[PDB]
Amino acid sequence: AASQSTPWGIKAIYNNSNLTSTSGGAGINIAVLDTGVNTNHPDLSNNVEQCKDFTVGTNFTDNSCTDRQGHGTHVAGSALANGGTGSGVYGVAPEADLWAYKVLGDDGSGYADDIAEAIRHAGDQATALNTKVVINMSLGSSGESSLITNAVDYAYDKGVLIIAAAGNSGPKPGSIGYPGALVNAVAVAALENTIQNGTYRVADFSSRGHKRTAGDYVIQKGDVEISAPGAAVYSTWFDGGYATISGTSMASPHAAGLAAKIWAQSPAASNVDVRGELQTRASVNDILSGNSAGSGDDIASGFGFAKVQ
């Protein structure tokens, strides 16, 4: 079984120190584009809906999404782990549907064309099934791939909400990477379990946005958008057990899970509506600590820390 039911970041985003379980996300699909997912993990299996591998062949191999690294399983767990039979770990939106899309191939990892194909496929599925999709991309690079960018824009136009890691190249200004830095991706900064200046603190490793476009509460290319728990995050692992790691990769699925929880309560809302709700929620929880964090919209934390309550 798990040694934690509700990890610190789950409790933090739920804003409840004694939380024993989570809820919500019904009907919303979280597409975790990553190293795959262990679809037999007891705390994930019941939420598995799609399992597709974009690293073998084109376009993809169906009914296949094996994680041999752990990242994708970890990320999926933060987003939507369901506690198993009651003794396992819980993620933010335990009633969401998991679409495990393997885009980081064994081993080493990820070609831009595989990632782009998966982003487009998620958009095509949103359209074909008339269903709501939140993409999570817990991945990043300093360089902008036009294949990935164009795929993001394509999916966003089709109504898909795209959440991504800000990157782990902080704390210096302008360290945000891609796809996080795209105007149609929600870049998520990583918080650590430290309260400073009254708020959770942005981790030093978390990539910062650019000074010239910050402070306006309007997202341009290069802006960090919201913050979520990303340091020392316990979650599911590819072996059917658990692991504790740190990264903006860990923050992203907290936000993707929250987005799904929000969306499930307004299922006819657009991606733009749900994104706006995340922005609003973040803005009332202004993050005030971490390098370059301060009052208002800043390059460390964007608008703030969107929560359940």
Among residues 5, 43, 67, 71, the one annotated as catalytic is 71
Q: 77-91: buried (b, 16+ CB within 10 Å) or exposed (e) per residue?
A: bbbbbbbbeeebbbb
71 has catalytic annotation = yes
Q: Residue 31 pairs with which residues in a beta bridge?
A: 99, 135
Task: Give min distance, CB of 223 to Na ion, in A.
Answer: 6
210 has catalytic annotation = no
Q: Among residue numbers 87 through 146, which ones bind Na ion (CB under 5 A)?
A: none
Binding mask 247-276 for Na ion (x = CB under 5 A): ------------------------------
Smaller CB separation from Ca ion, 234 or 303: 303
Closest to 14 in 3D by CA, of 258, 280, 279, 278: 258
Measured between alpha carbons, how far is residue 301 from residues 139, 181, 186, 199, 298 in Å? 18, 13, 12, 11, 6
Task: Give min distance, CB of 106 to Ca ion, in A.
Answer: 13
How far, in Å, CA of 169 to CA of 299, rounded? 13
Binding partner selected for residue 187 from Na ion, Ca ion, none, CB under the kind-specific 5 to 8 Å limit: Na ion
Does 286 help bind Ca ion (rule: CB under 5 A)?
A: yes
The one segment of 32-40, 78-86, 220-228, 274-282 that binds Ca ion by CB under 5 A: 220-228
43 has catalytic annotation = no
Task: Give min distance, CB of 154 to Na ion, in A.
Answer: 16
- Bridge-based pairing of strands 48-53 and 61-62 is antiparallel
Task: Give min distance, CB of 105 to Ca ion, in A.
Answer: 8
Does 162 help bind Na ion (rule: CB under 5 A)?
A: no
How far, in Å, CA of 92 to CA of 255, rounded? 8
Measured between alpha carbons, how far is residue 13 from residues 10, 31, 57, 200 in Å? 5, 20, 39, 11
Does 192 help bind Ca ion (rule: CB under 5 A)?
A: no
Residues catalogued as catalytic: 34, 71, 249
**Site residues, Na ion (CB under 5 A):** 182, 185, 187
